[PDB]
Amino acid sequence: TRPTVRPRNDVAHKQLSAFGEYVAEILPKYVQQVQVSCFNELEICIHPDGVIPVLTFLRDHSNAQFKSLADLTAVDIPTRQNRFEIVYNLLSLRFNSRIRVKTYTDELTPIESSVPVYKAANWYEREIWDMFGVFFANHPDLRRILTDYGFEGHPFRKDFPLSGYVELRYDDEVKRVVAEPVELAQEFRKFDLNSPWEAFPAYRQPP
Amino acid sequence: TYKYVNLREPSMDMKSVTDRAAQTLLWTELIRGLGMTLSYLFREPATINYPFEKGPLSPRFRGEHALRRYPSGEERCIACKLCEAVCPAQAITIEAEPRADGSRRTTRYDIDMTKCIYCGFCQEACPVDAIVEGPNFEFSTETHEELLYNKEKLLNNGDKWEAEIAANIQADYLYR
Amino acid sequence: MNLMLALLTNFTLATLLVIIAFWLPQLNVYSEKTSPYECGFDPMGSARLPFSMKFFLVAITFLLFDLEIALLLPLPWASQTANLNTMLTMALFLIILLAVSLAYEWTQKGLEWTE
Amino acid sequence: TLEGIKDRVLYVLKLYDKIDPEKLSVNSHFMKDLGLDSLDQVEIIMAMEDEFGFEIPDIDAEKLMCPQEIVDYIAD
Amino acid sequence: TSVKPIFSRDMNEAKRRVRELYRAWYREVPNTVHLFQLDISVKQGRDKVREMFKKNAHITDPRVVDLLVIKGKMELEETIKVWKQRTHVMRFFHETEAPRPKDFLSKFYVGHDP
Amino acid sequence: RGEYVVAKLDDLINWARRSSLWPMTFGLACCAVEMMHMAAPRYDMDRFGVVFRASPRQSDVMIVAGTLTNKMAPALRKVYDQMPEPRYVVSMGSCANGGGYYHYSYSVVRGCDRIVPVDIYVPGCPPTAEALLYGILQLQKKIKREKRLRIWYRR
Amino acid sequence: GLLKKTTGLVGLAVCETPHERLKILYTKILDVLGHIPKNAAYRKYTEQITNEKLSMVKAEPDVKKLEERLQGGQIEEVILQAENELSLARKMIQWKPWEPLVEEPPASQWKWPI
Amino acid sequence: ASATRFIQWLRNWASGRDLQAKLQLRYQEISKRTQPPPKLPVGPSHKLSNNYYCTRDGRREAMPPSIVMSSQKKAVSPAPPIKRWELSQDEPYL
Ligand SMILES: CCCCCCCCCCCCCCCCCC(=O)OC[C@H](COP(=O)([O-])OCC[N+](C)(C)C)OC(=O)CCCCCCCCCCCCCCCCC
Ligand SMILES: CCCCCCCCCCCCCCCCCC(=O)OC[C@H](COP(=O)(O)OCCN)OC(=O)CCCCCCCCCCCCCCCCC
Ligand SMILES: CCCCCCCCCCCCO[C@@H]1O[C@H](CO)[C@@H](O[C@H]2O[C@H](CO)[C@@H](O)[C@H](O)[C@H]2O)[C@H](O)[C@H]1O
Ligand SMILES: CCCCCCCCCCCCO[C@@H]1O[C@H](CO)[C@@H](O[C@H]2O[C@H](CO)[C@@H](O)[C@H](O)[C@H]2O)[C@H](O)[C@H]1O
Ligand code: SF4
Numbered sequence A: 001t002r003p004t005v006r007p008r009n010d011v012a013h014k015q016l017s018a019f020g021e022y023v024a025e026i027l028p029k030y031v032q033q034v035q036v037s038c039f040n041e042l043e044i045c046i047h048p049d050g051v052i053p054v055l056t057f058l059r060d061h062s063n064a065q066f067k068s069l070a071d072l073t074a075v076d077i078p079t080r081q082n083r084f085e086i087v088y089n090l091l092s093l094r095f096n097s098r099i100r101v102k103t104y105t106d107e108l109t110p111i112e113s114s115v116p117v118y119k120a121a122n123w124y125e126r127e128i129w130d131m132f133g134v135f136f137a138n139h140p141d142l143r144r145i146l147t148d149y150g151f152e153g154h155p156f157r158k159d160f161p162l163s164g165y166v167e168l169r170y171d172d173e174v175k176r177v178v179a180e181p182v183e184l185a186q187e188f189r190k191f192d193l194n195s196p197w198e199a200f201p202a203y204r205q206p207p
Numbered sequence B: 001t002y003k004y005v006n007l008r009e010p011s012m013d014m015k016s017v018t019d020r021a022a023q024t025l026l027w028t029e030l031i032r033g034l035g036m037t038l039s040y041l042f043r044e045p046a047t048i049n050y051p052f053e054k055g056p057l058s059p060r061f062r063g064e065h066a067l068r069r070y071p072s073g074e075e076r077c078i079a080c081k082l083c084e085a086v087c088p089a090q091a092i093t094i095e096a097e098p099r100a101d102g103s104r105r106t107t108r109y110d111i112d113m114t115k116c117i118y119c120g121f122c123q124e125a126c127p128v129d130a131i132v133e134g135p136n137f138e139f140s141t142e143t144h145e146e147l148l149y150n151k152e153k154l155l156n157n158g159d160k161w162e163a164e165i166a167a168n169i170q171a172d173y174l175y176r
Numbered sequence C: 001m002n003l004m005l006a007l008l009t010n011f012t013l014a015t016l017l018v019i020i021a022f023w024l025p026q027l028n029v030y031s032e033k034t035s036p037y038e039c040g041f042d043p044m045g046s047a048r049l050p051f052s053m054k055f056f057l058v059a060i061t062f063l064l065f066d067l068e069i070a071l072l073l074p075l076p077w078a079s080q081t082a083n084l085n086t087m088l089t090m091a092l093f094l095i096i097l098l099a100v101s102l103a104y105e106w107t108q109k110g111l112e113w114t115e
Numbered sequence D: 001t002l003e004g005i006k007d008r009v010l011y012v013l014k015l016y017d018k019i020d021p022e023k024l025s026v027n028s029h030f031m032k033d034l035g036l037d038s039l040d041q042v043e044i045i046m047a048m049e050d051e052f053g054f055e056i057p058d059i060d061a062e063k064l065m066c067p068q069e070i071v072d073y074i075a076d
Numbered sequence E: 001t002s003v004k005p006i007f008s009r010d011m012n013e014a015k016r017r018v019r020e021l022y023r024a025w026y027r028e029v030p031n032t033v034h035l036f037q038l039d040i041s042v043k044q045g046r047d048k049v050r051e052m053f054k055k056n057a058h059i060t061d062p063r064v065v066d067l068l069v070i071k072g073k074m075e076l077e078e079t080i081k082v083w084k085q086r087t088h089v090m091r092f093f094h095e096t097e098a099p100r101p102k103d104f105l106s107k108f109y110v111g112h113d114p
Numbered sequence F: 001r002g003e004y005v006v007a008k009l010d011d012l013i014n015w016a017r018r019s020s021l022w023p024m025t026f027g028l029a030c031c032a033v034e035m036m037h038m039a040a041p042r043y044d045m046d047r048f049g050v051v052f053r054a055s056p057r058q059s060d061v062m063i064v065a066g067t068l069t070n071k072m073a074p075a076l077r078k079v080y081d082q083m084p085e086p087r088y089v090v091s092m093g094s095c096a097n098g099g100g101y102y103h104y105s106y107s108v109v110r111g112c113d114r115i116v117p118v119d120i121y122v123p124g125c126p127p128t129a130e131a132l133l134y135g136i137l138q139l140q141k142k143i144k145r146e147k148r149l150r151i152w153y154r155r
Numbered sequence G: 001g002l003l004k005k006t007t008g009l010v011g012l013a014v015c016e017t018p019h020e021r022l023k024i025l026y027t028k029i030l031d032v033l034g035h036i037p038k039n040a041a042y043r044k045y046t047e048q049i050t051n052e053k054l055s056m057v058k059a060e061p062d063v064k065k066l067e068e069r070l071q072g073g074q075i076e077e078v079i080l081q082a083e084n085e086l087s088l089a090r091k092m093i094q095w096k097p098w099e100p101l102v103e104e105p106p107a108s109q110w111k112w113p114i
Numbered sequence H: 001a002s003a004t005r006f007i008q009w010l011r012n013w014a015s016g017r018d019l020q021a022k023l024q025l026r027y028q029e030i031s032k033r034t035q036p037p038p039k040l041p042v043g044p045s046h047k048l049s050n051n052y053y054c055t056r057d058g059r060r061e062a063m064p065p066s067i068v069m070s071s072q073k074k075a076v077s078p079a080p081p082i083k084r085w086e087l088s089q090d091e092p093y094l
């Protein structure tokens, strides 16, 4: 119990590992990977076809009972051919436990909408469509939610520039707000911060 | 542990039922609410007489920025650019070169006070206490341009406010 | 003549204040300034579109009840009659029938607004 | 009114600005002959829907490439 | 090259959805001008709609076409429901952008942009 | 002497206008919380004659208290145009002043002065309630210095 | 035991006959589980936990003492969970998740950091 | 604090509380605005020996996730069922 180091909890690590393979045994058709982090969080990585079967099972199964969708989001990794990682964070009140379910898609492949499983997923999928451009099939009402009306692009993609492409001002001649190509009085100053010395040997990739 | 906020069955005896009828017909609970606002009418108000009286502040207050000097009059800033690196808003802009006596000193030190989030990271990062956030908060301007501070403005602020800034630093530097 | 003069003065005074209000200040009229207000965004549809009345039945009942007060207002004068036996009976009969009419509309859910 | 329907359809095709009435014939082809494109053809069909007050589904509209082909279609 | 479709099995089905969208936009321009009190004519509005479809005429992937149609319907719904304001409808016409000549010499005189 | 008369009438209309500034009930983000504290008992803006009114038709001042996004910009301009005149704009906090923490975002207007004219800029993130009050009193003194009738007399 | 006045959860009505209702529901779940392949992990695990719950229901005639053994909250919460399990079992008949993995991911799909 | 006796009684009666004991305006009970200097303590790593950083390096103890299954017996739940909450004994019903 060194004072500055976060203590381990092996009991939680063991319990989550056992449940991880329990889920893999029951849904082998869709489960591609199961892992538990060193701070005791369980992740199920699945084929995208399994979004509805897997999420239904975790919600309704008597030994799972993940009734609450805490969060639904996406991550963009341009180096992958399926660049978008879709992440579901679920909470089980009955068993006081959390689980993460992850799948993937590319710019042109639809993902089945999870609104039938969780009504909470409605706006989360609109946000993912808005910020990443991932289409969700059978969504009752898919449209932008955060961006401006008529906004072009998906800002949270890694290749969308920080300041975008257009900016707004009031123009007296046309007596309205107009959109024009972005110019910055002071360009954002890119910093190269990474140290050229490796920090964490435990995570070194093979050469 | 938990408690129920609203789970109580009213008593159905004659006295209780007649107490509730009086409350309904004679508005007793509404009259009680009138008593509370009446008691406030006769309390001393909490208002202070600004600008003749001021709200209290502490030595840690983060206000207008200033560039400081050593007791000799030399500038403290040696253009390390730690403040510029840490600034969450990228509100600081710095240029530097050797001074005519070889000193390491800035030729530009701008703070865009309309970018700045007044977070105090720059004064935490400074190794020589050159850049600080002073105690002034009454510097609203009539134009946007007046809030784009260059080094001359920031040095004047330091010269203007140093008497208070040094006393504030004295009060709080043992907490840093 | 005093009543007519008092009314004329009141509405003349109000009209003069409105004349000053419109001819004293400096105006700067343009399209966006005079557009209708809806919290910063353009209205969807005309404000002249039908606006459903959910208390329509109470409103019609008001017309009938509003006329009952016209029958009841003479009661202070009717109390000056020598024929007080008849007047009191008829006075109570009218109020009771108004109460019965209110009770009917109440029990038959006529005072509840349409959903 | 098969005789008349040839006239209303020709009147609309005349009004449609992009079509030169000198090159227009009851057998003129919108793409090959009258020099129009798919969207122009779609525009013409909506003009037909107006003056005849009835709907031409896109499955139907895709085959009407000549003024006569429209005439044959209104008959039913 | 076996991929999950969005809506259209092939370009023939996609071009049907494109024509359906074009009709919906074409009918809508007269209302948009009237409702938004725009100072342009229905002809300019429909020419702009035509210009927007034309820039994408070179696509051959049905999935890309489907997404363009999905966005087109989203854009149309925003307009019909007056979620857009007049400023949004007029952003298609770029009325305040100065001309940017597109010949080598003109660019050479103004700067380094190719 | 007309000069004397117009000078005194300027003082009266200026005094009436600065003594009765009615800001629009309009706030955008965290800066609006400090604006609430200016209305709260410690500062009691109402004691200066400064009273919020929701309708733009009945407002003299727009306090832009928070970040102005691109999506919100047309609505801010709309309700400013719907204010009768004279009208004033106080820019409160870094976001409204020039973008602030979100200056480089794709969705943020870099300063509300791109959308509306601004009479006073109140610095801070957020400005303290006292700082905002200082800005309101600075606006009052700006209105006190106006010379509308003296300039009209010399036209 | 004396009846519950409320379950404490908005919209969850008290059940007058919880033992009988639970027996019906678990029996249904076992019936539906009989059309799933014998070696499918879902059937084996759900049969095991369903039979445990059913055994506890038969062996405990008191609701409060039964709620303690079930460890699923109010008895009306256990009934709702039994209904949710039945609905899932019917769906898993049509999904057949016991079949082999439909497709492997690309090479570096789950590699982090990149 | 300067309210006369009659006014104190009036607002005490109207509110139904003894308001003078818990006034919402602050007087002399607050801390002085000048304070003696502090002398803050140091942490457990302020030692001159037996203090090698490698033995107290939390960041370097983090490990990549444990791969339970990849595509390269009793039923379980994620954790034991949650224990039912108890009613408060301080005040079970408000
Ligand atoms: C409850 C009742 C309360 C009623 C209170 C009534 C107000 C009492 C205080 C009166 C003060 C004097 C009024 C000055 C305000 C004028 C508005 C203003 O600021 O304009 C600036 C303008 C400035 O104009 P400008 O020429 O400098 O420039 C404006 C034009 N642009 C925008 C292009 C620059 O002042 C004037 O134009 C004229 C000032 C005249 C001052 C004398 C007032 C005479 C009013 C008579 C008008 C004739 C119509 C009749 C109206 C009814 C008569 C009572
Ligand atoms: C000899 C035999 C004699 C025979 C005659 C005997 C007659 C006397 C006995 C009859 C009862 C007398 C009192 C009748 C008063 C009217 C009662 C009434 O209507 O109030 C009840 C009303 C009910 O509403 P609610 O509580 O929400 O629930 C009702 C469920 N349907 O609730 C309300 O109306 C609440 C009103 C809300 C708005 C109140 C806001 C102001 C409150 C402060 C007012 C203080 C009173 C000031 C009076 C000043 C008069 C100058
Ligand atoms: C839905 C239909 C409902 C119908 C309801 C009808 C209610 C009628 C109730 C009875 C009201 C009148 O009751 C009656 O009032 C009169 C006075 O006016 C009284 O009359 C008494 O006083 C009057 C003077 O005031 C004398 O002239 C008279 O000789 C004397 O008998 C009667 O003693 C009393 O019996
Ligand atoms: C002669 C003048 C003096 C006599 C008073 C004359 C007016 C009498 C009005 C009698 C009304 C009786 O009929 C009325 O009908 C409704 C049914 O919709 C009843 O019940 C309903 O209304 C009440 C109040 O709205 C609700 O609390 C109740 O949940 C609802 O079921 C009323 O409790 C009852 O009061
Ligand atoms: S206070 Fe914060 S935002 Fe402002 S200049 Fe310093 S580091 Fe930058």
Ligand code: SF4
Pocket: B076, B077, B078, B079, B080, B081, B082, B083, B084, B094, B122, B125, B126, B127, B128, B129, B130, B131
């Ligand atoms: S102000 Fe301080 S931190 Fe910033 S450049 Fe100067 S010495 Fe470095």
Ligand code: SF4
Pocket: F029, F030, F031, F032, F065, F066, F067, F092, F093, F094, F095, F096, F100, F101, F124, F125, F126, F127
């Ligand atoms: S200036 Fe600061 S406090 Fe004000 S809205 Fe922006 S981030 Fe929030």
